[PDB]
Amino acid sequence: AKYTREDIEKLVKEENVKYIRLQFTDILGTIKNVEIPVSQLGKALDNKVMFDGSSIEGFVRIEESDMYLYPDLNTFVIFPWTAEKGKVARFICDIYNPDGTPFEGDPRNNLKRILKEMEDLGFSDFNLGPEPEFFLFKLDEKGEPTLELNDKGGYFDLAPTDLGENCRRDIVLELEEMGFEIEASHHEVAPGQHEIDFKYAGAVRSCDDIQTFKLVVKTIARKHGLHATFMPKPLFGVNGSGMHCNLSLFKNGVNAFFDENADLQLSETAKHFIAGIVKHATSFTAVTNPTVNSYKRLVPGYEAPCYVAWSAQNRSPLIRIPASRGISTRVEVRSVDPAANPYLALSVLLAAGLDGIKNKLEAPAPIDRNIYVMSKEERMENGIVDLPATLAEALEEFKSNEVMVKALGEHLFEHFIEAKEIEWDMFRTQVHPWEREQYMSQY
Amino acid sequence: AKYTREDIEKLVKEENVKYIRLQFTDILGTIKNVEIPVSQLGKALDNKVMFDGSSIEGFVRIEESDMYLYPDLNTFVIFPWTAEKGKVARFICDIYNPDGTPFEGDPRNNLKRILKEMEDLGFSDFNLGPEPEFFLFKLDEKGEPTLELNDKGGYFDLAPTDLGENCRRDIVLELEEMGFEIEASHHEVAPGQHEIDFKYAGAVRSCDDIQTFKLVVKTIARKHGLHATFMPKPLFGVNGSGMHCNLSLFKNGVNAFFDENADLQLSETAKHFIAGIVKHATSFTAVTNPTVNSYKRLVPGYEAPCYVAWSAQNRSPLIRIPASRGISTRVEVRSVDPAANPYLALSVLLAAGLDGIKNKLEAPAPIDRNIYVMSKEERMENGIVDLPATLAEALEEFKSNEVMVKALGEHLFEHFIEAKEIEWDMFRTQVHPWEREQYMSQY
Numbered sequence: 001a002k003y004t005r006e007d008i009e010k011l012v013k014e015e016n017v018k019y020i021r022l023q024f025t026d027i028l029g030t031i032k033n034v035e036i037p038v039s040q041l042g043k044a045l046d047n048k049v050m051f052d053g054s055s056i057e058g059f060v061r062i063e064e065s066d067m068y069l070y071p072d073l074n075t076f077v078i079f080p081w082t083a084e085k086g087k088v089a090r091f092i093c094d095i096y097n098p099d100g101t102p103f104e105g106d107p108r109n110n111l112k113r114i115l116k117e118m119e120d121l122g123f124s125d126f127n128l129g130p131e132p133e134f135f136l137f138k139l140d141e142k143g144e145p146t147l148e149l150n151d152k153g154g155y156f157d158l159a160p161t162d163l164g165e166n167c168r169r170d171i172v173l174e175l176e177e178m179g180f181e182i183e184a185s186h187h188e189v190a191p192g193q194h195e196i197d198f199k200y201a202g203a204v205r206s207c208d209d210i211q212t213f214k215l216v217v218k219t220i221a222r223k224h225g226l227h228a229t230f231m232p233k234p235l236f237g238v239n240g241s242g243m244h245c246n247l248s249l250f251k252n253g254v255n256a257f258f259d260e261n262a263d264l265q266l267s268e269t270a271k272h273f274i275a276g277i278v279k280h281a282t283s284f285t286a287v288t289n290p291t292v293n294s295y296k297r298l299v300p301g302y303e304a305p306c307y308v309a310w311s312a313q314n315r316s317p318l319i320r321i322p323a324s325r326g327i328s329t330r331v332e333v334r335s336v337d338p339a340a341n342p343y344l345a346l347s348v349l350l351a352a353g354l355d356g357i358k359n360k361l362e363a364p365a366p367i368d369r370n371i372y373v374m375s376k377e378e379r380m381e382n383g384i385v386d387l388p389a390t391l392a393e394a395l396e397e398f399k400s401n402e403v404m405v406k407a408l409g410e411h412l413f414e415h416f417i418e419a420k421e422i423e424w425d426m427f428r429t430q431v432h433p434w435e436r437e438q439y440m441s442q443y
Numbered sequence: 444a445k446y447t448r449e450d451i452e453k454l455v456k457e458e459n460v461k462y463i464r465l466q467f468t469d470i471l472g473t474i475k476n477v478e479i480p481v482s483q484l485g486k487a488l489d490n491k492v493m494f495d496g497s498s499i500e501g502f503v504r505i506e507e508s509d510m511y512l513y514p515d516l517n518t519f520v521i522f523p524w525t526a527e528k529g530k531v532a533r534f535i536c537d538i539y540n541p542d543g544t545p546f547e548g549d550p551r552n553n554l555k556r557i558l559k560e561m562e563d564l565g566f567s568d569f570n571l572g573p574e575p576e577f578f579l580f581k582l583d584e585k586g587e588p589t590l591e592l593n594d595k596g597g598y599f600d601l602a603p604t605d606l607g608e609n610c611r612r613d614i615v616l617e618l619e620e621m622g623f624e625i626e627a628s629h630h631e632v633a634p635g636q637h638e639i640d641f642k643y644a645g646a647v648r649s650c651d652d653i654q655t656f657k658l659v660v661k662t663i664a665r666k667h668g669l670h671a672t673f674m675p676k677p678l679f680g681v682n683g684s685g686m687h688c689n690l691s692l693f694k695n696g697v698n699a700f701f702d703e704n705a706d707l708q709l710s711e712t713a714k715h716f717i718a719g720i721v722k723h724a725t726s727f728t729a730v731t732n733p734t735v736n737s738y739k740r741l742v743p744g745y746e747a748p749c750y751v752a753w754s755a756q757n758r759s760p761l762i763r764i765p766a767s768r769g770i771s772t773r774v775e776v777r778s779v780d781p782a783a784n785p786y787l788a789l790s791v792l793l794a795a796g797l798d799g800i801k802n803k804l805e806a807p808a809p810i811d812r813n814i815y816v817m818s819k820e821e822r823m824e825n826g827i828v829d830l831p832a833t834l835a836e837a838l839e840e841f842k843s844n845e846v847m848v849k850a851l852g853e854h855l856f857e858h859f860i861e862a863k864e865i866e867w868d869m870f871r872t873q874v875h876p877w878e879r880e881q882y883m884s885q886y
């Protein structure tokens with residue numbers, strides 16, 4: 001209980017809060033909201049504010065259906081940069097059906113659903129440590145994004161410098177003032193690319209922070225004349241952006257992946273997890289990489305995984321194990337990209353993990369200096385399968401899987417599939433310039 | 444009441460008001476005004492101010508006509524901007540004849556007429572909850588509007604951010620801190636499109652607030668290098684704008700549409716009232732949808748209605764019943780667009796409602812699924828009539844309906860048709876570029 005009804009009412013008043021953002025999330029991970037005047041804080045709470053909950057199905061809407069917003073008290077945040085006529089605060093909300101029950105088509109209420117599965121298996125927490133990467137492109141005259149990069153930095157370089165446009169700085173600083181907890185940040189591999197890493201938190205809080213963070217970013221960036229994009233593959237020839245997800249299970253407030261007396265100090269619990277992840281990656285990919293362009297980042301030549309394997313020391317492991325042990329033992333899934341919706345991502349991932357533990361699945365041998373050089377044939381002769389090559393591919397595999405379809409639930413699943421199938425069809429029917437360069441003179 | 448003579452005179456002096464706007468509306472909903480120096484406040488308040496009330500006719504104006512301006516103390520507000528050589532305030536007004544009686548051709552006086560009509564039927568209040576949607580475009584260098592939108596947001600998604608322009612916010616903030624009572628706001632389907640929704644009120648107050656809204660909007664957006672418009676379909680191939688009106692009747696301070704032990708918890712009255720809107724839609728469309736361009740929004744595929752029908756959950760029903768009951772039990776007409784003169788629309792709607800209540804009309808089958816596919820023929824065999832395709836058609840239907848004509852008033856009616864027929868006549872003789880593109884080389 002971070003705040004209570006009164007603590008918030010007291011707080012709204014102590015400060016000059018005048019505008020309330022009741023923010024949620026549609027199925028495509030897009031960050032939505034309905035805004036009220038502070039004069040509606042009461043109705044807001046009391047969970048009495050209604051809206052067209054079909055905003056959640058995204059562009060595949062069809063009819064208008066009324067739904068309730070239920071604000072999550074302990075997610076109460078006051079935005080800093082505000083203060084014009086008054087300040088602005090917010091609430092992340094859970095969408096309820098008009099009859100009282102939570103709306104099953106809501107991404108957030110789904111994570112919770114599967115977190116009940118985790119607790120019934122006997123676990124207390126499922127932690128996440130996101131490593132979200134993003135590009136900074138320059139704005140032009142007419143305030144339009146351009147293909148020009150904010151800087152020419154390389155890997156863990158000393159990016160932009162402490163003389164203005166240091167977006168990373170203000171971002172990290174602003175986030176820390178908003179109550180976040182950052183672990184560290186750094187410039188990434190390509191020029192004009194960045195990464196800020198959050199401290200670990202419980203699935204929900206971590207997912208909620210990832211949403212805010214993206215928002216916070218986009219804003220500060222515009223403030224500096226820049227464009228932030230979390231597009232996975234903005235530029236052919238340059239690195240893409242992914243969002244590795246460090247994962248851990250807890251039991252009685254004790255880390256469960258750690259076993260000092262076992263191979264790699266990794267519990268049997270830990271290894272079943274890895275096991276399930278390997279079993280389901282080619283199937284949960286259409287979710288952790290939800291866009292067409294997500295697949296342009298998933299190619300040889302960069303640090304992105306193109307095959308299902310794990311390792312503690314390799315070029316592009318879809319699963320990795322950081323060095324830290326004990327209270328910090330965790331599995332890192334390095335295929336997830338920032339285009340992915342966190343609640344859904346952690347839904348399918350948490351689910352594929354539990355499917356390993358439930359069924360004492362057996363993990364394969366850790367890969368190490370092989371995958372990349374051995375032809376897809378040699379790789380294939382082993383547990384080494386290629387991830388889907390296109391969104392259409394990822395979608396077939398997804399549907400085939402029963403434990404992944406369950407991870408969403410009939411509503412979240414029907415529509416996701418619908419929207420993505422359109423997205424692909426639009427792309428497939430499209431005639432790109434590249435083809436005209438190739439065939440228009442040659443034929 | 445709310446304000447009394449001396450209360451106002453105290454307010455003006457203390458707040459340092461120096462410029463009064465005597466505000467009113469013409470047939471085309473356009474917002475007129477005669478403006479006096481604070482020093483003339485007395486003359487004003489004694490109902491002694493005169494002006495050319497033929498301004499009410501709009502461009503159909505032929506001869507001049509001296510009329511009086513009667514301020515309404517309860518509509519007194521002080522505009523928040525202003526404060527140069529002093530502050531500004533307005534008074535919404537009723538137009539009188541030089542012989543002391545209210546001028547009929549005045550739309551505000553017209554609704555007050557049909558309202559009294561309602562009371563004879565023994566009703567207490569007529570409530571409106573409007574949801575006015577608008578587009579924000581950019582102003583060019585010359586300060587001239589362009590076809591460039593203010594953002595790329597969609598339905599309900601949190602956009603734009605709290606750093607910069609954020610018109611919607613600054614509008615609601617101004618409205619709220621200016622006496623208004625807003626419920627919520629949000630981004631709309633099309634990029635650059637926005638909607639603010641106010642708490643319900645009685646017809647007159649609700650119509651006055653709609654006229655003040657538009658203004659405050661138009662104003663705020665201009666202040667941010669933007670152009671607001673309530674033009675129904677500014678752009679082909681994107682969503683148009685509309686102003687669904689949420690209607691409810693009270694009897695002795697109690698909602699008369701509600702009824703627990705009923706079906707859908709809708710009272711017999713409700714069912715009848717609905718019945719009325721059903722049989723007058725095609726004949727009141729010309730009023731709720733007054734511009735030529737209004738009918739370019741009335742095309743299938745964009746959430747806007749096209750047939751006379753009512754549902755509780757459908758793609759784009761002319762009428763729909765939102766979830767809430769009890770006090771919130773209401774009928775929503777989704778035909779109405781912003782271009783419409785709120786006073787005329789509300790009066791033509793109240794009138795059609797009461798008519799169906801008066802003559803105990805039998806409401807038709809609520810539409811299940813599909814009015815889109817179910818072709819003309821079939822749609823007919825189900826008593827589903829199409830709205831008028833063009834302003835012309837709309838007029839021929841309005842002119843045929845005895846009760847609708849009576850809702851307007853001999854004067855209002857005569858001049859409204861006069862305007863619309865010339866408006867249509869122009870648009871019909873115009874040779875648009877589209878014709879040239881399709882025909883000039885073809886023939």
Ligand SMILES: NC(=O)CC[C@H](N)C(=O)O
Binds near residue numbers: 745777
């Ligand atoms: N109800 C909505 O928000 C859709 C509005 C849409 N622009 C219309 O014409 O009705």
Ligand SMILES: [Mg+2]
Binds near residue numbers: 062
């Ligand atoms: Mg559906």
Ligand SMILES: [Mg+2]
Binds near residue numbers: 131133188195
């Ligand atoms: Mg990194």
Ligand SMILES: [Mg+2]
Binds near residue numbers: 332334
């Ligand atoms: Mg990593």
Ligand SMILES: [Mg+2]
Binds near residue numbers: 505
């Ligand atoms: Mg005349």
Ligand SMILES: [Mg+2]
Binds near residue numbers: 638
């Ligand atoms: Mg709307």
Ligand SMILES: [Mg+2]
Binds near residue numbers: 574687
């Ligand atoms: Mg509506």
